Design a protein around this ligand. Structure first.
Ligand SMILES: C[C@H](NC(=O)[C@H](Cc1ccc(F)cc1)NC(=O)Cc1cccc(O)c1)c1ccccc1
Length: 447
């Protein structure tokens, strides 16, 4: 387990970029929007309409989710045809193409380039969320398979934190360096191009997908570190048998069989309960929300939510195992509804009380803290536990489509719903946070 580190460290670089790309468009919203109006001026001798400047910037962040959907749809296409390692390596192309489009979008005076780059890197991120968990699982010793699989979540949450830090006026969240803020992703990509070619190919890919029974020996000994691996090798040949038993059902057969229509409904909802709860309302627009409240140094409060998120993710790991799943998803769904209530108060009494902007900070700090123990991980700890090795694939793909879709709904509609509800937006999240509470209380079984 010495070369094992390099193989994992090179893989998590994708999940770091996943988090970084999820939250670079938070702090620098004001500056890029100014570039949008300045570009609109140069083109049509006209100041941009505030409603278009809204739907346009919303499209700039939301189109990323569209890409993630297509990406998550294409995981299996590349992963079995080209292997796990080689897929992660070649798909660094999208990151490099993306970084150029976004980094040079200012010099090119084109919000299209920024939008188009945002879309592509989204595709990379939708593919990455399927490469990294699969590769780290098809490489780790069975014992460490649980722990090492954690790093995907950590990379995502840490990646968000780094993007929020770099989004300060001091570093790159300003008028001169926001193109470098979106482009810096090329450094992670370059680091993954240097590393990966030295990393091993998935033994399972060599063994099953490629029939390289003895070439798979070579990886396991250098990788697992030990001398021989007749324990590990046979373990893979037991899963391959168990997995090839029941015919893999397709997405189509999943909808049509009334045997699956109840658990699939539970899955899709648990996914909707993650995105429509409204965390990406903060992780996309935190800096904007805090400002509307009346917070000095709002970006720092966004860095705050990022730090809280990382802390409560390290915590969630020690809790999910030592407690039940049905309880945690309700504990989180409730604490979020409460914080969403806390928010609304601090957002109404602020016009009168100039200090509730401190309560709004606590509101979101706890709003994300409760998400990271409930609606965050559990939706995945249930889908895999609701299905066997036959329908679990098609279930994951559907649940993934549900996640990206509801993610696209918040990212694209939150600002449109904000210009109507005033300080009552989080009521909508509090409404849903209740409906989801009701649903999981009666219709979700414990596992
Ligand atoms: C895209 C979709 N879901 C995710 O990526 C969510 C969405 C999310 C979660 C938290 C957050 F703060 C922001 C977003 N994130 C993830 O890490 C997915 C995941 C994690 C562990 C195991 C899995 O099988 C999937 C997905 C679908 C199928 C496979 C992998 C991911």
């Amino acid at each position: 387990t010495g070369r094992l580190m390099l193989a994992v460290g090179g893989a998590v670089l994708g999940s770091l970029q996943f988090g970084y790309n999820t939250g670079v468009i938070n702090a620098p919203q004001k500056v890029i929007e100014e570039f949008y109006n300045q570009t609109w001026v140069h083109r049509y001798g006209e100041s941009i309409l505030p409603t278009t400047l809204t739907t346009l910037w919303s499209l700039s962040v939301a189109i990323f989710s569209v890409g993630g959907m297509i990406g998550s749809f294409s995981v299996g296409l590349f992963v079995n045809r080209f292997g796990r390692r080689n897929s992660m390596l070649m798909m660094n192309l999208l990151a490099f193409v993306s970084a150029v489009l976004m980094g040079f979008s200012k010099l090119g005076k084109s919000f299209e380039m920024l939008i188009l780059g945002r879309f592509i890197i989204g595709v990379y991120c939708g593919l990455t969320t399927g490469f990294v968990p699969m590769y780290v699982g098809e490489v780790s010793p069975t014992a460490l398979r649980g722990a090492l699989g954690t790093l995907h979540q950590l990379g995502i949450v840490v990646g968000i934190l780094i993007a929020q830090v770099f989004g300060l006026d001091s570093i790159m969240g300003n008028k001169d360096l926001w193109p470098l803020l979106l482009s810096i992703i090329f450094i992670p990509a370059l680091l993954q191009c240097i590393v990966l070619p030295f990393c091993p190919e998935s033994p399972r890919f060599l063994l099953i997908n490629r029939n390289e029974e003895n070439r798979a020996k070579s990886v396991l000994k250098k990788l697992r570190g030990t001398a021989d691996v007749t324990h590990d090798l046979q373990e893979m040949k037991e899963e391959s048998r168990q997995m090839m038993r029941e015919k893999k059902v397709t997405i189509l057969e999943l909808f049509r069989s009334p045997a699956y229509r109840q658990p699939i409904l539970i899955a899709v909802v648990l996914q909707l309960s993650q995105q429509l709860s409204g965390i990406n309302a903060v992780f996309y627009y935190s800096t904007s929300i805090f400002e509307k409240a009346g917070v000095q140094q709002p970006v720092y409060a966004t860095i705050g939510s990022g730090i809280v998120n990382t802390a409560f993710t390290v915590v969630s790991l020690f809790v999910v195992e030592r407690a039940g799943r049905r309880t945690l998803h309700l504990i989180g769904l409730a604490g979020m509804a409460g914080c969403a209530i806390l928010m609304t108060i601090a957002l109404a009494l602020l016009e009168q009380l100039p200090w509730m902007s401190y309560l709004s900070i606590v509101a979101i700090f706890g709003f994300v803290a409760f998400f990271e123990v409930g609606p965050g991980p559990i939706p995945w700890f249930i889908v895999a536990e609701l299905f066997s090795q036959g329908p679990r694939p098609a279930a994951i793909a559907v649940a993934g489509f549900s996640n990206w879709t509801s993610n696209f709904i918040v990212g694209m509609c939150f600002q449109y719903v904000e210009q109507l509800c005033g300080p009552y937006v989080f009521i909508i999240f509090t409404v849903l946070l209740v409906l989801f509470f009701i649903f999981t209380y009666f219709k979700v079984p414990e596992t």
